[PDB]
């Protein structure tokens, strides 16, 4: 997208979202990042939404194919699962490459740095979902390390109701439960996150209250499923 204006890439990313053309949206936002300027709050959200939808479709397809493959145990099911898996890993690597070159190192504010580090943890988590051996442990540790640095910053720099802080804790708790085989850590994090947000709700406006309570409900839903 080197020949397209940064502003046009952003405008077209928004159009692609309206058209539910998430592959296009991701390519447009990738081009915008590669312009080399930092991303605004809105622009970060566009980047996140685009790639979340793309990898979301790949993860759903991988789970369908992995389930069929396990029930069978010709080479076709394995071959096709491998093809989808390789495409998913390529998208994760692309996102991680954008964060490493050079979104994270230029992110100084808590809101941007926590956002990117949460992304880093998420896409290593997606890699961990399909990983098996020799690399699964290192991939899991890469996810944990990114989430942990994001947690440390968010606890120091953000109120307990901040939606980025809440969504980071939600996803880190999912990492603990689904990836790290640490369901007690997952439950403890979700509970402490929920309780500390509840005690901070009195400080919020009507609109901020709606934003925070929506994510607290997601924490509650998980606790209900896990306990």
């Amino acid at each position: 997208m080197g020949s397209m204006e940064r502003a046009s890439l952003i405008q077209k990313a928004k159009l692609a979202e309206q058209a539910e053309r998430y592959e296009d949206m991701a390519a447009f936002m990738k081009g915008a990042v590669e312009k080399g300027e930092e991303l605004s709050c809105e622009e970060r959200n566009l980047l996140s939404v685009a790639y979340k939808n793309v990898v979301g479709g790949q993860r759903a397809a991988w789970r369908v194919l992995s389930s069929i493959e396990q029930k069978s145990n010709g080479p076709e099911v394995r071959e096709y699962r491998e093809k989808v898996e390789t495409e998913l890993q390529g998208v994760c690597d692309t996102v991680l490459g954008l964060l490493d070159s050079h979104l994270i190192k230029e992110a100084g504010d808590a809101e941007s740095r926590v956002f990117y580090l949460k992304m880093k943890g998420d896409y290593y988590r997606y890699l961990a979902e399909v990983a098996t051996g020799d690399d699964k442990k290192r991939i899991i540790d890469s996810a944990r390390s990114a989430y942990q640095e994001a947690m440390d910053i968010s606890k120091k720099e953000m109120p307990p109701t901040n939606p980025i802080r809440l969504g980071l804790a939600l996803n880190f708790s999912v990492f603990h439960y689904e990836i790290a085989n640490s369901p007690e850590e997952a439950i403890s994090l979700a509970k402490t996150t929920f309780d500390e947000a509840m005690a901070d709700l009195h400080t919020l406006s009507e609109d901020s209250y709606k934003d925070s309570t929506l994510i607290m409900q997601l924490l509650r839903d998980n606790l209900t499923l896990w306990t």
């Binding site: 996140s48 939404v49 939808n53």
Partner: peptide, 9 residues
């Protein structure tokens, strides 16, 4: 177990 949907906006 649900992560942040994050698919809209």
């Amino acid at each position: 177990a649900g992560s942040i949907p994050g698919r809209r906006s």
